[PDB]
Design an enzyme around this catalytic site. Structure first.
Site, PDB file in Angstrom:
ATOM      1  N   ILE A  10       0.808  -1.230   0.000  1.00  0.00           N
ATOM      2  CA  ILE A  10       0.000   0.000   0.000  1.00  0.00           C
ATOM      3  C   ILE A  10       0.838   1.275   0.000  1.00  0.00           C
ATOM      4  O   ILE A  10       0.463   2.280  -0.597  1.00  0.00           O
ATOM      5  CB  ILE A  10      -0.855   0.090   1.280  1.00  0.00           C
ATOM      6  CG1 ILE A  10      -2.232  -0.525   1.070  1.00  0.00           C
ATOM      7  CG2 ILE A  10      -1.009   1.537   1.711  1.00  0.00           C
ATOM      8  CD1 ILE A  10      -3.096  -0.444   2.318  1.00  0.00           C
ATOM      9  N   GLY A  11       1.944   1.245   0.729  1.00  0.00           N
ATOM     10  CA  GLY A  11       2.764   2.426   0.911  1.00  0.00           C
ATOM     11  C   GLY A  11       4.177   2.084   1.326  1.00  0.00           C
ATOM     12  O   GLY A  11       4.446   0.992   1.825  1.00  0.00           O
ATOM     13  N   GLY A  13       7.577   4.129   3.288  1.00  0.00           N
ATOM     14  CA  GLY A  13       8.070   5.310   3.988  1.00  0.00           C
ATOM     15  C   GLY A  13       9.533   5.161   4.361  1.00  0.00           C
ATOM     16  O   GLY A  13      10.229   4.282   3.836  1.00  0.00           O
ATOM     17  N   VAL A  17       7.124  -0.043   5.786  1.00  0.00           N
ATOM     18  CA  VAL A  17       6.314  -0.263   4.609  1.00  0.00           C
ATOM     19  C   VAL A  17       4.913  -0.653   5.074  1.00  0.00           C
ATOM     20  O   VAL A  17       4.750  -1.245   6.143  1.00  0.00           O
ATOM     21  CB  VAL A  17       6.913  -1.376   3.734  1.00  0.00           C
ATOM     22  CG1 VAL A  17       7.089  -2.647   4.555  1.00  0.00           C
ATOM     23  CG2 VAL A  17       6.047  -1.627   2.504  1.00  0.00           C
ATOM     24  N   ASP A 120       3.188  15.697  10.841  1.00  0.00           N
ATOM     25  CA  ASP A 120       3.438  15.477   9.404  1.00  0.00           C
ATOM     26  C   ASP A 120       2.170  15.300   8.567  1.00  0.00           C
ATOM     27  O   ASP A 120       2.094  14.403   7.731  1.00  0.00           O
ATOM     28  CB  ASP A 120       4.352  14.262   9.215  1.00  0.00           C
ATOM     29  CG  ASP A 120       4.965  14.197   7.816  1.00  0.00           C
ATOM     30  OD1 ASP A 120       5.001  15.228   7.111  1.00  0.00           O
ATOM     31  OD2 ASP A 120       5.412  13.104   7.427  1.00  0.00           O
ATOM     32  N   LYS A 122      -0.409  15.540   5.694  1.00  0.00           N
ATOM     33  CA  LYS A 122      -0.382  15.791   4.267  1.00  0.00           C
ATOM     34  C   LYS A 122      -1.464  14.953   3.626  1.00  0.00           C
ATOM     35  O   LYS A 122      -1.964  14.021   4.261  1.00  0.00           O
ATOM     36  CB  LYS A 122       1.003  15.480   3.697  1.00  0.00           C
ATOM     37  CG  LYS A 122       1.542  14.143   4.060  1.00  0.00           C
ATOM     38  CD  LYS A 122       3.049  14.103   3.860  1.00  0.00           C
ATOM     39  CE  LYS A 122       3.594  12.733   4.187  1.00  0.00           C
ATOM     40  NZ  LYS A 122       5.043  12.610   3.803  1.00  0.00           N
TER      41      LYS A 122
HETATM   42  C1  LIG Z   1       0.904   7.237  -0.030  1.00  0.00           C
HETATM   43  N1  LIG Z   1      -0.440   6.620  -0.076  1.00  0.00           N
HETATM   44  C2  LIG Z   1      -0.829   6.088   1.258  1.00  0.00           C
HETATM   45  C3  LIG Z   1      -2.244   5.577   1.145  1.00  0.00           C
HETATM   46  N2  LIG Z   1      -2.228   4.545   0.139  1.00  0.00           N
HETATM   47  C4  LIG Z   1      -3.472   3.912   0.147  1.00  0.00           C
HETATM   48  C5  LIG Z   1      -4.190   3.673  -0.999  1.00  0.00           C
HETATM   49  C6  LIG Z   1      -5.412   3.044  -0.986  1.00  0.00           C
HETATM   50  C7  LIG Z   1      -6.007   2.608   0.173  1.00  0.00           C
HETATM   51  C8  LIG Z   1      -5.299   2.838   1.338  1.00  0.00           C
HETATM   52  N3  LIG Z   1      -5.632   2.518   2.627  1.00  0.00           N
HETATM   53  C9  LIG Z   1      -4.637   2.936   3.370  1.00  0.00           C
HETATM   54  C10 LIG Z   1      -4.594   2.798   4.841  1.00  0.00           C
HETATM   55  N4  LIG Z   1      -5.602   2.247   5.530  1.00  0.00           N
HETATM   56  N5  LIG Z   1      -5.208   2.352   6.808  1.00  0.00           N
HETATM   57  C11 LIG Z   1      -3.991   2.947   6.965  1.00  0.00           C
HETATM   58  C12 LIG Z   1      -3.300   3.240   8.112  1.00  0.00           C
HETATM   59  C13 LIG Z   1      -2.085   3.858   7.925  1.00  0.00           C
HETATM   60  C14 LIG Z   1      -1.335   4.275   9.077  1.00  0.00           C
HETATM   61  C15 LIG Z   1       0.038   4.293   9.125  1.00  0.00           C
HETATM   62  C16 LIG Z   1       0.686   4.761  10.246  1.00  0.00           C
HETATM   63  C17 LIG Z   1      -0.026   5.213  11.335  1.00  0.00           C
HETATM   64  N6  LIG Z   1       0.629   5.697  12.483  1.00  0.00           N
HETATM   65  C18 LIG Z   1      -1.402   5.191  11.290  1.00  0.00           C
HETATM   66  C19 LIG Z   1      -2.042   4.733  10.164  1.00  0.00           C
HETATM   67  C20 LIG Z   1      -1.627   4.154   6.665  1.00  0.00           C
HETATM   68  C21 LIG Z   1      -2.335   3.876   5.519  1.00  0.00           C
HETATM   69  C22 LIG Z   1      -3.558   3.254   5.693  1.00  0.00           C
HETATM   70  N7  LIG Z   1      -3.677   3.524   2.599  1.00  0.00           N
HETATM   71  C23 LIG Z   1      -4.077   3.470   1.298  1.00  0.00           C
HETATM   72  C24 LIG Z   1      -1.935   5.049  -1.184  1.00  0.00           C
HETATM   73  C25 LIG Z   1      -0.540   5.627  -1.177  1.00  0.00           C
END
Ligand SMILES: CN1CCN(c2cccc3nc(-c4n[nH]c5cc(-c6ccc(N)cc6)ccc45)[nH]c23)CC1
Length: 277
Positions: A10-11, A13, A17, A120, A122
């Site tokens: 998904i991501g 950093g 990851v 942070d 964004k």
């Molecule tokens: C750059 N982007 C990021 C999001 N990406 C993304 C795309 C499509 C669906 C997505 N769902 C997430 C997601 N669901 N829950 C999360 C929790 C954290 C989290 C991580 C750390 C903490 N502390 C809390 C929550 C980060 C990301 C997500 N991210 C998605 C697409 C690319």
């Protein structure tokens, strides 16, 4: 961790990851962050687990095994960045912009009342669902500078909850104009882009600024631009609120709590977005 099957990456950093994964047990689909360690951080994270709020992405579980740390989060289906990109030709309708802003100020008011800072914010770590919700994710404990508060850029070491308000102000602006407000590609370019728009800060508008660690008397002196030029489409109530979120002086900068009472939110509603998942 054998309790999880990774579905897709998904991501990525600089901490870890993030994968979409399924709990082979709970059956749930979750976001699994693999952190790649300090006991103090174990307790720091243990505290984020209690910090529960409708507009904060839920930390479901923390898994510490071997030299890895896994954080299991509630999964949401899209980020604000993608939604902004997808809405770029039409623009996000104002009522929806207002709803997202309001909800994020609620999330921040909560965090901040518990003396927790995001640090942070964004578009990429603001997550949305089909129900009209938007939630704070990726709390902080190539890096994009675009949303960084000026006190951080000038070397203030013990900065405040006000940094999150600045970031959200920049995101607000961006949703309205469909362009980044301050798209800097270095710390000094970020700082100078801020100066060129809001004017070079001085002791008049920001007492103490000239004695901040990275402040230089040799900074160029630019005049403040007219705010009606900065976020044109936006109405006076919006511009008023934005200006208070973007005050130089972190102590003059509006709080999350106070922002929620701003006239801009008198007619706030909760539209549902059209998400293509
Ligand atoms: C750059 N982007 C990021 C999001 N990406 C993304 C795309 C499509 C669906 C997505 N769902 C997430 C997601 N669901 N829950 C999360 C929790 C954290 C989290 C991580 C750390 C903490 N502390 C809390 C929550 C980060 C990301 C997500 N991210 C998605 C697409 C690319």
């Amino acid at each position: 961790m054998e309790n999880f099957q990774k579905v897709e990456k998904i991501g990525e950093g600089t901490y870890g990851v993030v994968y979409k994964a399924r709990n082979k047990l709970t059956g749930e689909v979750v976001a699994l962050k693999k952190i790649r360690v300090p006991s103090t951080a174990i307790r720091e994270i243990s505290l984020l687990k209690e910090l529960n709020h409708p507009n904060i992405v839920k930390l479901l579980d923390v898994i510490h095994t071997e030299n890895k740390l896994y954080l299991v989060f509630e999964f949401l289906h899209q980020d604000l960045k993608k939604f902004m990109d997808a809405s770029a030709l039409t623009g996000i309708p104002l009522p929806l912009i207002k709803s997202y802003l309001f909800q994020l100020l609620q999330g921040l008011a909560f965090c901040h009342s518990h003396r927790v800072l995001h640090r942070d914010l964004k578009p990429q770590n603001l997550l949305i669902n089909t129900e009209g919700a938007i939630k704070l994710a990726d709390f902080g404990l190539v890096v994009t500078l675009w949303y960084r508060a000026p006190e951080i850029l000038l070397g203030c070491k013990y900065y405040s909850t006000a940094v999150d308000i600045w970031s959200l102000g920049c995101i607000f602006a961006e949703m309205v104009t469909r362009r980044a407000l301050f798209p800097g590609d270095s710390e000094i370019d970020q700082l100078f882009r801020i100066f060129r728009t809001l004017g070079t800060p001085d002791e008049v508008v920001w007492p103490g600024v000239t004695s901040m660690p990275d402040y230089k008397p040799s900074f160029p002196k630019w005049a403040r631009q007219d705010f009606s030029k900065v976020v044109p489409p936006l109405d006076e109530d919006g511009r008023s609120l934005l200006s208070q979120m973007l005050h130089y002086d972190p102590n003059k900068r509006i709080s999350a709590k106070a922002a929620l009472a701003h006239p801009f939110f008198q007619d706030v509603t909760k539209p549902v977005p059209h998400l293509r998942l």
